[PDB]
């Protein structure tokens, strides 16, 4: 049903429709010689589209654009990157050049600049304190606290009870810690519990990499992070 790493060639993107006017996008990328899948979101807002995350590099993000055009055929006008790493902002220049207004928090923009990663143009205000939520069209954006990265946002689509966790939330397949050099391991579980307290109504939970699940992915992630800590 949900597209899998093993069914997606590196360079192609697939869409999965989760509800009316809500899709995930799935791509794959090589990292240290393994192949990973990676998810983002697409959310309809009237006659245009809001994109959440790039598809992890220029080539994948151009493909995502063409796949959106062929399967949905609405224009992407805005995009939000959920943190500063390349699976979230790699492709921002491609988006900018297609006339998409690219957004991320000041924090994310700062960290991307330092890192040498592509920098979203626009700044999302009101997200600097743990627990902050802002409305961004047909979604709510939430800063739960440091976890996978200090700047990690999550995204909730109230219309469809879809919570998009990005890299702060692990799929059930991942049973040891992923890529954590920029992580706040000590605060990651407190951050997830903020997510649980703010979106206890979420039905469909999407991790940054892999298959979606329910609110159990939050508990799963907490288990994996505490086991890594120990
Ligand atoms: N100061 C640190 C040096 N800069 C470092 C900044 C991060 C980059 C690595 C990187 O690009 N990682 C992304 C791609 C990736 C790959 C595997 C698992 C995950 C996961 O989500 O678990 C994943 O997602 B990420 O967002 O983390 C290395 C240099
Ligand atoms: Zn990351
Ligand atoms: Zn603009
Ligand atoms: Zn990631």
Resolution in A: 1.8
Q: Which residues contact 186 (CB under 8 A, 6 or more apart)?
A: 229
Q: Report residue 2: phi and psi, to 5°.
A: -65, 130
Domain boundaries defined on the chain: 1-230
- Return the active site residues: 83, 85, 87, 148, 179
Distances (CA, A) of 53 to 33, 104, 185, 197, 225: 23, 10, 23, 24, 23
Q: Coil, helix or strand for 181?
A: coil
Q: How far is the CA of 151 from the centre of ligand 4 (A)?
A: 13
Q: Which atom of ligand 1 is nearest to the CA of 170?
A: 22
Give residues with Cβ within 8 angstroms of 33, minimum separation 6.
none
The closest-lying atom of ligand 1 relative to the alpha carbon of residue 86 is: 11
């Amino acid at each position: 049903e949900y597209p899998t790493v093993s069914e997606i060639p590196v360079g192609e993107v697939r869409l999965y429709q989760i509800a009316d006017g809500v899709w995930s996008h799935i791509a794959t990328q090589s990292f240290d010689g393994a192949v990973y899948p990676s998810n983002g979101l697409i959310v309809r807002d009237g006659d245009e589209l809001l994109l959440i995350d790039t598809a992890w590099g220029a080539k994948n993000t151009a493909a995502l654009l063409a796949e959106i055009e062929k399967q949905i055929g609405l224009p992407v006008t805005r995009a939000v990157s959920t943190h500063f790493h390349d699976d979230r902002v790699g492709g921002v220049d491609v988006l900018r050049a297609a006339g998409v207004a690219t957004y991320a928090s000041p924090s994310t923009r700062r960290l991307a600049e330092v890192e040498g990663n592509e920098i979203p143009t626009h700044s999302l205000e009101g997200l600097s304190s743990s627990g902050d939520a802002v409305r961004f069209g047909p979604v709510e954006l939430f800063y739960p606290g440091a976890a996978h990265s200090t700047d990690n946002l999550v995204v909730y689509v109230p219309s469809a009870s879809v919570l998009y966790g990005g890299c702060a939330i692990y799929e059930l397949s991942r049973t040891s810690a992923g890529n954590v050099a920029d992580a706040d391991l000590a605060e990651w579980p407190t951050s997830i519990e903020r997510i649980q307290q703010h979106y206890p109504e979420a039905q469909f939970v999407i991790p940054g990499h892999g298959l979606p699940g329910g609110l159990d992915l939050l508990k799963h992630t907490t288990n994996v992070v505490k086991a890594h800590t120990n």
